[PDB]
Amino acid sequence: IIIRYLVRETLKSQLAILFILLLIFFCQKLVRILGAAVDGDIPANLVLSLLGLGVPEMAQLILPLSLFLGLLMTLGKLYTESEITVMHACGLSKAVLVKAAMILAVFTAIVAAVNVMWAGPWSSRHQDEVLADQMDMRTLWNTDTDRARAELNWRITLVVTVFMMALMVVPLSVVNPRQGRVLSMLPAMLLYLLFFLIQTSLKSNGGKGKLDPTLWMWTVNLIYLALAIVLNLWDTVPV
Amino acid sequence: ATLTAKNLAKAYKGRRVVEDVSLTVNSGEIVGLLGPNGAGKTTTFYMVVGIVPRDAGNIIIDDDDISLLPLHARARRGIGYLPQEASIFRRLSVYDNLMAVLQIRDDLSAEQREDRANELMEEFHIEHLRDSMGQSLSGGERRRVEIARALAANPKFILLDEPFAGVDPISVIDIKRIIEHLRDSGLGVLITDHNVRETLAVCERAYIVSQGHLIAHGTPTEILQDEHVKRVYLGEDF
Amino acid sequence: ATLTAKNLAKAYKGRRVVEDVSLTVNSGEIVGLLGPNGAGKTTTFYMVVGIVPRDAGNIIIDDDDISLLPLHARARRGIGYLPQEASIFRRLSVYDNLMAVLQIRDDLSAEQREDRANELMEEFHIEHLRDSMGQSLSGGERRRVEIARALAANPKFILLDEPFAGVDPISVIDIKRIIEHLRDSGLGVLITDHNVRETLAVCERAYIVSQGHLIAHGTPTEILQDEHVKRVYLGEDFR
Amino acid sequence: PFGVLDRYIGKTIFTTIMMTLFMLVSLSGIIKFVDQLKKAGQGSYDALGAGMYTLLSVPKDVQIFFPMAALLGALLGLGMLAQRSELVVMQASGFTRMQVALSVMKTAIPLVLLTMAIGEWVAPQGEQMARNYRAQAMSISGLHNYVKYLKGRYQLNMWSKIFQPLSVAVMMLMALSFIFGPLRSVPMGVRVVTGISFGFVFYVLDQIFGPLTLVYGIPPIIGALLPSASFFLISLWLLMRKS
Ligand SMILES: CCCCCCCCCCCCCC(=O)O[C@H](CCCCCCCCCCC)CC(=O)O[C@@H]1[C@@H](NC(=O)C[C@@H](CCCCCCCCCCC)OC(=O)CCCCCCCCCCC)[C@H](OC[C@H]2O[C@H](OP(=O)(O)O)[C@H](NC(=O)C[C@H](O)CCCCCCCCCCC)[C@@H](OC(=O)C[C@H](O)CCCCCCCCCCC)[C@@H]2O)O[C@H](CO[C@]2(C(=O)O)C[C@@H](O[C@]3(C(=O)O)C[C@@H](O)[C@@H](O)[C@@H]([C@H](O)CO)O3)[C@@H](O[C@H]3O[C@H]([C@@H](O)CO)[C@@H](OP(=O)(O)O)[C@H](O[C@H]4O[C@H]([C@@H](O)CO[C@H]5O[C@H]([C@@H](O)CO)[C@@H](O)[C@H](O)[C@@H]5O)[C@@H](OP(=O)(O)O)[C@H](O)[C@@H]4O)[C@@H]3O)[C@@H]([C@H](O)CO)O2)[C@H]1OP(=O)(O)O
Ligand SMILES: CCCCCCCCCCC1=C(C)C(=O)C(OC)=C(OC)C1=O
Ligand SMILES: CCCCCCCCCCC1=C(C)C(=O)C(OC)=C(OC)C1=O
């Protein structure tokens, strides 16, 4: 029951950020498309429909982010109303806070995988079909085993980050009444920013070839995953 | 049982807020922990519950050390907490949030959940609210549910936190009635608040702590007779 | 002078929280405004001050209607408001708080403010602290500088909001000795706190409201022996 | 005229504007820095855009971050005075509401005289060598007479820079109407979220509905004045509503 209360409450705040963070990304995708239309190609055409083919590419960021931002807004809302302090003052653990952040993360993972397998390729095949080897964006998920800069990893590191950002929020959305409610997100929001600045500057900096998922792209995914466990299992002896 | 709290201490940035307080409570006995707002009363109460981790101290619930445990593990072995502000589950029915705690106690069968939940709605007069959600009740109706589900965890020594908190004097004649009800079921209540004209009427013995150490204890007719409390707190009370 | 109020009315959405409340405070006279919570006793108080705009009322000081006026123009007719919070200017020294509002009055010449300020710091026995800021004064100087600052704007009907409001019963003698001193300078005062044990022990009249309107307006010995107020309010034992 | 309340209500707003703008340009420095070393490797390690994009591109970023950090500090600094209950007690002593308005606007005179100071001498001179120090390893005076070397898209760029200080003074006017408008002792979290919402709407309304007016048909001088005047009318309507 208390899991079905937590999943039903974050989902109404996750399906609301998905239509709020959409306007931020739609407008930002519309700023850069006007620079290539007031001086680029003639805009008697695609400018509405080309924007509609950018949504499964911008869904690679707003789908892990809406779960990350959704668990901050709800658990921040339930601590300050003293509903989680009274949750485990009458007998339950922090596991029910973790077993509610993963039964929800399974929902967003199978939308992130269906977005990154044969939905991103479907639009990028059609995006160049309206403007009428080394592609790595049209290329479907099976034949990413060929050669040098196959970026199968940035197509697989954003399905893992749906699960792993769901584990960093339940120990970091504790709110101290000294710091207030809006200041207890800057530990968590800056930590999300430090993840996608490294994940992007190891894909494009490592695509042309200096450092690849051999000793650099999956060690930052694992120092940042083991951080999500030692921060979550602080209730023991120190090591 | 015989919850005992010996030698509690704490340091906040070098400052000493509490040193060597010794308060006990037996079953079927309301003890009070009050004092002036110098840290004292507040931080000592948040160690018996367990939201504040101790510096050095020993809490035992009548046989066993629980002092190194969190709040949530202490709720399995007894102790049940009531927050000060409104802590009913806001979007859930009254029967649901009375059941969402009752689904966790694992020494019951699935047909014993429905009798025990029905035994609590009849006891606290909430049978006429079994479908209504939260955030739609009054300060005398929400407070009934907040106890009716913290009693559903099978506790010993419910310890309430400021359960007067600003309320008119006609609605303290029933807050005192459900508190004297819990004494008549074998649960030693530990009350702590600001409203000192009422807890000295309901308690059997109080623990006035002030400026660190515990300064006096005993029956409330010995409290007003004492002169040493009278310089820091309760100037010319009655 | 006198401050009288005539037939207050206030309705937010449908329900009328205030329905025809009238009071009269004279000079040199404490009078409480009491009642249960949500019965309008915090709404008919703020209508006298002017935070919430009245609807059908008539607030009158001795020979001027002020019912249309906002708070900033009502504070020059001789009305002083003291909120139930800290309300000390934090990053401004305790001399400057009694100087920042002495410069508001225009009938005081430039030299005539400093001897008035040193008079106020001497009268409330706070002369010894002059350079302390206000972020760190006391619990007992967060209540004496507020009065010595709201007295500096030359009030006539200083309106307290919850003076006791959770202090020690040893500090209810020191925040009561300066309320009776506040009326000794010819200054009516309207307490409206919640803790009904000491507002009846300091005042001379009361105005207990219940859900829209007055119930009794006598001295405290005409209220504890009343029968109608002992059912929606205090109870059956108050000896 | 410059009392004690005048030098205190206009000082907290000056620091919280000046120390928000530092916290927004440093965040726009770091995520511009790691953008400019995924290009390095052409004879330039801290020289392409990594190292010397700190004095050469930061005065450009205190011009596109300056209006939405002027709505902000006049909301996060003035909202601080309303949270700890010092703005209702200024009115309860005689300091009126049009004197609060008169004292936040006196703060804006160092602000708008600084922005057109470094919007003419420092920002284009920095940004001009911000490309030369990159391309080697791979104003109002200077932009007025170039309107006749065409014989559109550039006259909008000049005319949206003269009353760009007017975009700063309108933001503190809108941030003042929110404090005397939907205030309700609303917590500090919402004043952060209504400071980003109308802050982001300004950035969209400046760069979308600037050129979109020009493409259809308009004089360019009113398309530059649209993102400030449409935020002057919202502040004016919000002021004359609760009375
Ligand atoms: C709810 C709360 C939270 C909300 C969060 C919301 C988040 C929204 C995010 C939206 C964006 C998401 C993006 C994404 O998705 O996520 C990415 C990942 C990270 C995501 C993180 C997300 C989560 C965050 C979470 C936070 C916590 C919650 C990032 C991205 O996107 O990263 C990158 C992006 N990032 C950003 O902008 C930062 C991003 C980061 C994200 C946002 C972070 C926000 C955080 C907010 C919260 C903070 C909380 C604490 O923020 C922005 O945007 C800001 C947007 C507004 C934000 C508002 C935020 C607040 C909102 C609040 C709302 C309520 C970057 O931009 C760079 C700068 O651009 C302008 O600079 P300038 O203006 O110019 O100065 C900006 N100006 C501006 O923005 C203006 C703005 O007004 C300024 C700011 C305004 C602020 C407004 C504020 C409002 C405030 C309101 C109040 C607060 C700068 O601004 C900046 O810095 C911005 C500044 O910091 C500010 C930032 C924001 C600050 C915010 C503060 C907030 C404060 C409050 C809150 C605290 C900006 O940095 O571009 C990169 C791609 O570019 C490249 C590349 O590098 O690969 C090169 C491009 O070409 C150019 C160039 O354009 O420069 C020119 C070329 O000529 C060349 O020179 C080249 C290089 O030099 C070469 O060496 O460079 C182009 O090339 C291709 O096309 C060209 C042409 O056709 C079209 O152009 C061709 O030209 P040509 O052919 O010649 O025509 C090219 O040809 C060359 O190359 C060919 C090939 O080689 C190419 O290669 C292929 O072929 C090879 C083979 O051939 C051989 O092998 C292969 O080998 C290769 O592998 C490959 O296959 C050759 O072919 P051959 O012939 O040789 O074969 C050819 O010959 C020739 O050589 C080529 O083909 C391109 C293309 O994309 C794909 O093809 O690719 C992107 O990488 P990407 O990721 O990879 O794409
Ligand atoms: C986290 C930083 C951005 C916060 C943006 C506002 C979030 C609150 C508004 C969205 C929301 C809407 C519109 C909403 O309608 C809604 O309805 C039931 C919510 O429920 C939980 C919402 O969260
Ligand atoms: C229009 C382009 C900018 C959009 C900015 C986001 C607007 C939606 C999110 C903010 C928001 C929140 C958080 C919110 O809580 C809220 O509550 C009632 C809103 O009401 C209208 C909001 O707008």
Author numbering:
A (entry chain F): 2 to 133, 247 to 353
B (entry chain B): 2 to 239
C (entry chain A): 2 to 240
D (entry chain G): 3 to 140, 250 to 262, 269 to 360
Passage from the reporting paper:
We also obtained cryo-EM structure of LptB2FG complexed with LPS to compare the conformational changes with and without the presence of LptC. In this study, we used cryo-EM to resolve an LPS-bound structure of sfLptB2FG at overall 3.7 Å resolution with TM domain at 3.2 Å resolution. The cryo-EM maps of sfLptB2FG show clear side chain densities in the nucleotide-binding domains (NBDs) and the two transmembrane domains (TMDs), allowing us to unambiguously fit models of NBDs and TMDs of LptB2FG. The densities for the periplasmic domains of LptF and LptG are at low resolution but are clearly visible. The cryo-EM structure reveals a clear LPS density in the central cavity, showing all six acyl tails, glucosamine disaccharide phosphorylated at 1′ and 4′ positions, and the inner core oligosaccharide. The LPS molecule trapped is a natural substrate of sfLptB2FG that was overexpressed in the E. coli C43(DE3) strain. The acyl tails of LPS are drooped and perpendicular to the IM plane in the upper cavity and the inner core positioned above in the periplasmic space. In the cavity, hydrophobic residues I25, F26, L62, L66, L70 and M303 of LptF and L26, I33, I66, F67, I313, F317 and Y320 of LptG interact with the LPS acyl tails via van der Waals interactions. Charged residues K34, K62, R133 and R136 of LptG and R33 of LptF form salt bonds with the 1′-phosphate group of LPS, while K40 of LptG and K317 of LptF form salt bonds with the 4′-phosphate group of LPS. D37 of LptG interacts with the glucosamine disaccharide of lipid A. K322, R263 and Q248 of LptF and K41 of LptG interact with the inner core oligosaccharide.
